[model samples]
Target: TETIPDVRRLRALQAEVHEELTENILKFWATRTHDPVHGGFVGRVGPDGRPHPEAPRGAILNARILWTFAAAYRQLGTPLYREMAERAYRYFVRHFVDAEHGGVYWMVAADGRPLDTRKHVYAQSFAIYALSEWHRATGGEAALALARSIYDLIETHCADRVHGGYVEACDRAWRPLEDARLSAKDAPEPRSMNTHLHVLEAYANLYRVWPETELAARLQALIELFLRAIYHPATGHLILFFDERWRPRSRAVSFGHDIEASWLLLEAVDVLGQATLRPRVQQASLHLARATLAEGRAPDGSLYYEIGEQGHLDTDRHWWPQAEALVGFLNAYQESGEVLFYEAAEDVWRYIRERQRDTRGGEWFARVRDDGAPYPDDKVDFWKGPYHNGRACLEAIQRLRHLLEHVRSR
Candidate 1:
């Protein structure tokens, strides 16, 4: 026998998430971050709520902006949200998408010219994700065409046929590059779990609308790749970096990626509609979520950032992992009917409300110290955007509503 969750309590939690998304997360990006003069959202906003107009904008940030608002409009049916999504879409296609080259540029000047001409596969995946979502929201042929173009570009240029997974970076003409690092923090490896995971995500989203036979094949292959090569079955963790031969390059453990993948991989499987693969992916997702709980969580109910290869633990609780933890734990609860998973989800939500959120500053703090102090980092930056927290709030609300409906029916 399964114990049912409290229906009224679940509805209340859903309402709270709705309020947070409408009032805090969406409001911050809509009002504070958008730049009227330069067009598109500002690249960075400091902890003090000051925007740097001259800062070089990143394609990842802008693409995430496009995806978040497009998703919000599609889900909530708000006109204001649609307007914001349109702003992001126009800016992204106009500036970020390279007309000369096939894929998107890495960085652009504030005035909407290419700053860094390098084509990173990670950035191109986000473009596909955002463009696909825009097409889903608006039914625009151009957006879908652009997304398909990027998908073709990735398969033709970035993906390694000799090897299984895609390479990290390439030059403007899609030639291999010496330094393939996504950022200074990442290793210069050819393949990474981060890149593949997001590529899996993009492909899944695209399959929802396109559903071409070739796209379905690629999506299924990506899921198989995760199960066979990227995921370490023994550790219940994803291998961070790898060589062309699928050899692991680092021993670092990223709790954020672990929890994020738990849900994203399951979503990909669901979209694929392969009943044969569902049970395997469901079990793997539960294992990943449980492993994160066992090794990654702090006493205060927040997740730590990462553990280095040298056995050093980085205990800072970043905003994104906490957001992912809430959704991932709830996902585990739904899959397993386990009370512990529900409690973990609720605990992470409480932690976000009490500690991770900045009531005065609008959006969440980038990271919180072990002692519960907010670290001094930009509220908006090249790496940080509204996608994680905003998507978490929307996802939690929808999941809880569905759960409450199930409880009532039962």
Candidate 2:
């Protein structure tokens, strides 16, 4: 392990990073990101962090806010966090919920009207995740009921009876769609690592609060999905897109998803308590983390977004990847007591603070060039949200606190 200078100073520095992120970055979303007139959050914030009020709102975006605020309140025990969580809940139920159908829509108009009513499995999982957390935070019966409803909807309508995994997207009436890409950049295929990852993620959280037998079984199935289908044993990278039979459809390395999955997969296995599966999942988790470290990190300590065939790298540093890299590296450090992991977390924090964060604007910029110039993209959008960075901060503080205390006690 390399030298981590100033252990006492490092503790102080970690706390400062947590405080700065929670107050300046996370708090801004709770206070200013919402659309009071239209409902849910403002659809977009430009590169300058100015909200585009008339832009279309997305179910994924609204649900992510709910999940982030709800989880923040659970972790912080702050009254403001609860208040924002409740606000998110009300906004989500009012606008994003498809009362006629059993699942959530893909997109909505700016004035709280349904726009693209396709029932994307990923969006439904997010709704379940948000509702379950909201129920945990507020003891809200309605939220739990809605979560269960969405859970059943997915299990019945979206799950592939023959293929043994969830389908990607469906029409407003839950009929299957030909094109199921989450966005244009994604492959227009039937299954994706992205959707399955969130389904497992959301189901694991819902199981924590609800503990339904059906959910427990579904949770285990999703974990098996990762172990069997998503992860390529030969290359450690998840196949990004898939066919209906769960065949590999694309070959691009998403560093953010890779590192994020390292922790998320272990989390699923941990929650399921399937001791028999732990050894394999644990090894896979560590391998995923190590692969990200070896291939993703640039010379400047920040993570690049994607890598293509022939080892061509997309050098742009997206905000969410940096956020996840902070927690993911810290997670690796906690598991192995590796000084390199700790240094990775600290270096990413420094990069985020100095480059990604917009001090004049309220929150972080969406992405930056390799040389640290801001990319012209919306700060708040369907893809960007508080979940990654806010959760990263909350998780890191808790993890670091435990680590520092353990060292001091020893």
Candidate 3:
């Protein structure tokens, strides 16, 4: 009892984390990714500050950049964050948004021409996520309007009326696609947990500001969808892919996504303010955290990448999953008042301090091997950007502040 963590310890750690968000994560993107020559952002930045101009720019990366900066500005009121957000908003609006078609493009050339041209549902959800945040912070009416339009696009085109959750991707014209996979690694199924999870997240963000009755209904339904269709209560994990009728398609497991959903779905419920759905989501959320802790977490407090379909395990740690683990574990500690969860959070942070942060490059390394060797992955790319770590810092600060009060009251 005497050794239990208290308010004083949390306060000091929170202060340190605030600096990491502002100085390390946010500032790194502010200084590095902006593409003055290309007028948006560089498509890719290599591990040690190398810029690969030829790497095609992605809608996911740009929108994630937008969401990260806008959310940071709202949380910390940093002028640089706002500037970065503005840069991303303007570039995405000018380049990514397809005026002719309904949703945003999947990827763009460095010069901002449409590259992939397929309007993936994942792409639209992220666009809505970012646009809504940009609007939330700045009251950018255009931003909200775009978000609303994208929301409607998802419902109109992506929603699986016969089934429950949303589909994966569509052609530029919003027609049914032969191959709807979000990425090459994902199964080319009609539906996927990754796409629906983001759609759930994006809808929650949109509903946070908009709060239309329709949006509210959809958000509520999505929460239930997770509990009933996506969550595997027996295994305490989410099914990765599904057929048109929400049938499971993959046995693979992503520890990062599991931890991320633990908190993110809880956040959707909070945003929804629907107390009736609370118990089931909280139960599922806690189970997710516990599952990750019991099976996925490594001895050094980091999480393994994934469990393959063949039952083979990949022990390499990636940057984003650890970010999720930190937030998810801390969130579990806050909810459960269990010191083990809190200690798990601290262990991951220590692991991050020692291994993940690219001390020479100033952000985090993309991947670290099991033997403590770093993988030479890109620092900034189509899928890698500021969102996971940036949002982790912001969420950690908020949770830590409340935790101080929570513990003090005890």
User: How many clashing pairs in candidate 3?
Assistant: 0
lDDT, candidate 1, at 198: 91
- The Cα local distance difference test for each model comes to 0.90, 0.83, 0.89
Report how far off residue 318 is in candidate 2 (Å): 0.5
Number of backbone collisions per candidate:
0, 0, 0
lDDT of 2 by residue, 1-410 (tens): 43443658568767877786677877788767877777667888887668887998888888888888888888888887787778778878887888998778788888878899999999999999999988888789999999999888888778987887888788988888888888778877788899999999999989888888878888888888888888887887888888878888788899899889988888888888889887888777777878888889887778999987446789998888998898888887766667788888888888888888877776788889988788788878888888888888888888777776664552
For each candidate in turn, give its C-alpha RMSD to the true structure in angstroms.
1.1, 2.1, 1.7
For candidate 1, write residues 40-149 as lDDT tens digits.
89999998999987799999999999999999999999898999999998988899999887889999999998999899989999999999999999999999999999
Instruction: Tell me the TM-score of each prediction against the true structure.
Output: 0.98, 0.95, 0.97
Q: Which stretches of candidate 1 lie over 4 Å from their true place?
A: 408-410
Q: Which numbered prediction scores highest in lDDT against the true structure? A: 1
Model 3 C-alpha lDDT per residue in residues 1-410, reported as the tens digit of each score? 43347777888778878878877887788888887788877889987798776679999999999999999999989788898999999989988999887789999898888888898888999999999999999999999999999889889987877778776778888886879876688887787888888999999999989999999999888888899889899999999988887889999999899999999899999998988998889899999999999999889999999999899889998999999999999988877777899899999998988998888888889999999999988899989989999999899999888777654442
lDDT, model 1, position 58 = 96
Report the poorest 10 consecutive residues by lDDT, candidate 3. Answer: 401-410
Query: Residue 282 CA error for candidate 2 (Å)?
Result: 0.8
At residue 398, give the lDDT of candidate 3.
93
